[PDB]
């Protein structure tokens, strides 16, 4: 076939939560896998594929906050993990850094995926500041292990969630907003992989921009009316949740989707917004897709790397 296989793997409590919320929202052409030391949380997982790691180590009661326990559980379940991953051309590993299962096992899962040739993308959170300095330091070590294990890594500091809520936004909704990064990135990459464009981008272009690239920005912006293209681009590159800014980006995959009214001029304006915002000359892998069922709506998908 010529259709890449995409899998999303949630490791630990936060990653399993992300998996479950993405499933609830509705995702179609992606295989979800849940990996955990916590048997109860895994029994509540909506993922079609489930891997309880560290069963003898932990008896399904969790790894605690020893990254080494989660790491050992993952390494001891390597074969199960590999069998679950087999067939994947692209693998998204999502996890909450700080704990023992995510922080320790997500890099092992990512390394396993990377050594099977899958384009391996990490989307991990850092703990809130109020969780303390030891938690944040452990999260940092986990983030560096992730960087060493993945093709590219998106970090979402939980503190940024305090910048998008008002005083009454339910925690559930804010966590759904954090998960939207991963979900909308997966959906955009999927659509781009699948849909032929007037300037065509395929999976190999995604690899070009994301293979062995370290830190990354992943964003999407939708807009309508006058100045829609510029505004969608600005939305795409200006997410308050992402640690990495677009500045200093050396590579960028950029796709623009619109109706049949999509003008070359406004696509140029969007690409200029992105190319200038980097404050650098950026290797842009650029694409355009005409979705005739859109009308006055323009969607700008951006993936930046090279920091
Ligand atoms: N955004 C978000 N962050 C989470 C969620 N659950 C946990 N976290 C964060 O991830 C860290 C690790 O928690 P968790 O994944 O449950 O620990 P582990 O499963 O033992 O590795 C926590 O300290 C939180 O900062 C979630 O549902 N959403």
Numbering used by the authors: 9 to 315
The authors write:
FtsZ is an assembling GTPase that plays a key role during bacterial cell division. This widely conserved protein polymerizes in the presence of GTP and metal cations into polar filaments that gather at the center of dividing cells to form a dynamic Z-ring. First, GTP hydrolysis only occurs within the filament, as the complete catalytic site is formed at the interface between adjacent FtsZ monomers. We report a dozen filament structures of the FtsZ core (residues 12 to 316) from the pathogen S. aureus, hereafter SaFtsZ, in complex with various GTP mimetics and metal ions.
Our structural studies identified D46, Q48, R143, N208, D210, and D213, all conserved across species, as key residues for subunit association or GTP hydrolysis. Mutations D46A, R143Q, N208L, D210N, and D213N all suppress SaFtsZ assembly as monitored by light scattering and polymer sedimentation, supporting a prominent role in filament formation. In accordance, the crystal structures of mutants D46A and D210N exhibit altered configurations at Region D. In the D210N mutant, the top T7 loop lacks K+ and moves 2 Å away from the bottom monomer, while the bottom T3 loop is severely rearranged. The relevance of this crosstalk area is highlighted by mutational analysis showing that D46A, N208L, D210N, and D213N, all impair filament formation in solution. In agreement, the structures of mutants D46A and D210N exhibit an altered configuration around this area. First, we identified swinging of D210 in the top T7 loop as a key event to position the catalytic water for attack over the γ-phosphate of GTP.
